[PDB]
């Protein structure tokens, strides 16, 4: 029936994985959201005229076993790799998440988008050029976002969906 896209949001703690997901799905900016809570968010949306279901796992990197987490990593179709533009360490951590995803999929051709979040903040330490060079090295799109203002939020997730469409054929 209706097309479903299974997405997974990964990245270092505090980059805005939860805020991005909640902004996309519920259209508000959360002030605080327990950093250990991992949950799935679903919504029917229209992307490029195609009505579909998004099924998004907001990961929290906890050690406790979750059969749902395993199912999303195994069957997840695309991944958002998120850092914050005011958090150099979170950008350095990106490679770890990409390498993990490649192992889960046993492939270097996994639908993926690099997300530089918190672009509303002036305290930038990761230049747009640094992130563009990383994305080019991976061969993936790079999108700057603000979960606070909504800038780039739909584009980040929808671009990932478009990458999944490519990978299917
Ligand atoms: N200024 C700003 N703050 C953000 C943005 N996204 C998230 N935050 C804040 O950063 C903190 C961590 O966000 P959160 O979604 O919990 O990060 P997570 O650990 O990756 O899930 C929270 O206090 C959010 O309100 C953003 O785009 N801009
Ligand atoms: Mg979170
Ligand atoms: Mg919206
Ligand atoms: Mg520098």
Numbering used by the authors: 0 to 168
Please share text taken word for word from the publication where this structure appeared:
RAS proteins are binary molecular switches that cycle between active guanosine triphosphate (GTP)-bound and inactive guanosine diphosphate (GDP)-bound states. The role of magnesium as an essential cofactor for small GTPases is well established as it is required for both high-affinity nucleotide binding and GTP hydrolysis.
To understand the role of the iMet, we made a new KRAS expression construct (1–169) that included the iMet and crystallized it in complex with GDP. Crystal structures of GDP-bound KRAS (1–169) in two different crystal forms were solved, both diffracting to a resolution of 1.45 Å. From hereon we refer to these two structures as the Mg2+-bound KRAS-GDP structure. The structural superposition shows that in the Mg2+-bound KRAS (1–169)-GDP structure, the iMet interacts with residues L52, T50 and Q43 (present on β2 and β3 strands) via hydrophobic and van der Waals interaction. A structural superposition of Mg2+-free KRAS-GDP with Mg2+-bound KRAS GDP structures shows large conformational changes not only in the switch I but also in the interswitch region.
